[PDB]
Antibody
Framework: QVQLQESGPGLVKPSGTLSLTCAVS?????????WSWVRQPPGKGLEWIGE???????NYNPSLKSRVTISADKSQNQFSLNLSSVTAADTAVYYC???????????????????????WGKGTTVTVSGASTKGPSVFPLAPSSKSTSGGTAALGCLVKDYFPEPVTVSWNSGALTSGVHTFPAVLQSSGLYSLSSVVTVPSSSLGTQTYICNVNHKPSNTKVDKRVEPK | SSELTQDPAVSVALGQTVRITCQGD??????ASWHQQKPGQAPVLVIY???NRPSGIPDRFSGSRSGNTASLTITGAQAEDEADYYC????????????FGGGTKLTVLGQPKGAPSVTLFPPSSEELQANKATLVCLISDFYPGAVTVAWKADSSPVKAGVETTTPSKQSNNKYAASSYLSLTPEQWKSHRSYSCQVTHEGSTVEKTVAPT
């Protein structure tokens, strides 16, 4: 029943300070467990940042200790992370997670010598850049007679020229999950990203049903809901 | 960043057994856990430690120890096992910081090949009414992940204005790619047709769009 949700800025200027917050429902951050922060740079592995227990006791990665701060708000069931003097090496997806209690001495039952991360959040993407945020231009990819494959047909949305990542696309407010494929973004020579989301639908139900793609770009605090009508 | 050494990539044939190993002097004090990560998703714990597994993890996953080396063995590997695997534990000295392995890309051989699905879209009315023109060629569901994308103006190759991704694995172990061709509305209307050619394992799929 335990759910975690990170929240952050998405874009941080170099030498700035990154501030994230993980809200917890169905569990208590004031417990003896170790509520942790993990990050994963794009195309790389996981790196451990720190942990906090009972809302007070902290433990950090030795290589990051000089600029990492983890605090907890026991009244809002939240714990937060603060990383100062950021560079491009701090660009990563930041996960909050939960580790179990343990013993530092070799004198405890067997249950207290595990480390595992069984509960994770979805992760929030953070980019360290001096470039400015740009919201996306959403265009409809309307179905035609060449986007058809017999009984089915393809329609989509072009999410063009945005920065930074990520962009999430749902269809009909999440009611339409079958047949949806959101393609990974392309990094263009301008420094801006672009991606496309495409959903496959019955060609007979084109004129009898409305299809809207929901494009969320949190780094710019913009949501675009574009209606897709046949060509 | 990483403290335990894993092989960055190992392979196993569908149905065979593979042992992904995790080594380091930091390991000797605590139990090693294993985390699985599919593309585009957060990690998923597959081994608590020792040989304990959470719910939803098949019996073919198992954990074992041999001093400073932990091992995740997969007996009878399936296609759903293709992912990245991370061992984790705590340092037995000092303030006991958490210790991650570098990660291991697991490839499962013998999966069925697949021809690419190619979807080509012309520039939308709203984009042209805004004095912009972009051609979108979406390639998906091809295996292996080797594919060449090429654009044609009428029948002549075009290279300027083409932005292509490198193939990336989908959640169903097949691959996807995208190529965007940016033109002016004059370039779009001054040609009879435009084409997106996609070659995969010696075979080519070609889609064509016109100002119609």
């Amino acid at each position: 029943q335990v759910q975690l949700q990170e929240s952050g800025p998405g874009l941080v200027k170099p030498s700035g300070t990154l501030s994230l917050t993980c809200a917890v429902s169905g569990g208590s951050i004031s417990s003896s467990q170790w509520w942790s922060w993990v990050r994963q740079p794009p195309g790389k592995g996981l790196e451990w940042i720190g942990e906090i227990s009972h809302g007070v006791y902290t433990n950090y990665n030795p290589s990051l200790k000089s600029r990492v701060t983890i605090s907890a708000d026991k009244s809002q069931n939240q714990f937060s992370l603060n990383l100062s003097s950021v560079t491009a090496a701090d660009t990563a997806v930041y996960y909050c997670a939960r580790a179990p209690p343990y013993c530092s001495s070799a004198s405890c039952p067997d249950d207290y010598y595990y480390f595992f991360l069984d509960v994770w959040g979805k992760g929030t993407t953070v980019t360290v850049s001096g470039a400015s945020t740009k919201g996306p231009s959403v265009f409809p990819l309307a179905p035609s007679s060449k986007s058809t494959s017999g009984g089915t047909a393809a329609l989509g949305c072009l999410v063009k020229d945005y920065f930074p990542e990520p962009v999430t696309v749902s269809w009909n407010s999440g009611a339409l999950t079958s047949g949806v494929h959101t393609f990974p973004a392309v990094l263009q020579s301008s420094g801006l990203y672009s991606l496309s989301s495409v959903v496959t639908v019955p060609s007979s139900s084109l004129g009898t049903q409305t299809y809207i793609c929901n494009v969320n770009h949190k780094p710019s605090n913009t949501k675009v809901d574009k209606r897709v009508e046949p060509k | 960043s990483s403290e335990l050494t894993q092989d960055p990539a190992v392979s196993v044939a569908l149905g065979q057994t593979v042992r992904i190993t995790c080594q380091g002097d930091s390991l000797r004090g605590y139990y090693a856990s294993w985390h699985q990560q599919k593309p585009g998703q957060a990690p998923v714990l597959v081994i608590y430690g020792k040989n304990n597994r959470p719910s939803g993890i098949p019996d073919r996953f198992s954990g074992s120890r041999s001093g400073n080396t932990a091992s995740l063995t997969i007996t009878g590997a399936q296609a759903e096992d293709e992912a990245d695997y991370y061992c984790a534990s705590r340092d037995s000295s000092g303030n006991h910081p958490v210790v991650f392995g570098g990660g291991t890309k697991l490839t499962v051989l013998g999966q069925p090949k697949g021809a690419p699905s190619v979807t080509l879209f012309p520039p939308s009315s709203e984009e042209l009414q805004a004095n912009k023109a972009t051609l979108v060629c979406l390639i998906s569901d091809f295996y292996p992940g080797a594919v060449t994308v090429a654009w044609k103006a009428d029948s002549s190759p075009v290279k300027a204005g083409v932005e292509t991704t490198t193939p990336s694995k989908q959640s169903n172990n097949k691959y996807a790619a995208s190529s965007y061709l940016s033109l002016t509305p004059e370039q779009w209307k001054s040609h009879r047709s435009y084409s997106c050619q996609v070659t995969h394992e010696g075979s080519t799929v070609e889609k064509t769009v016109a100002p119609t």
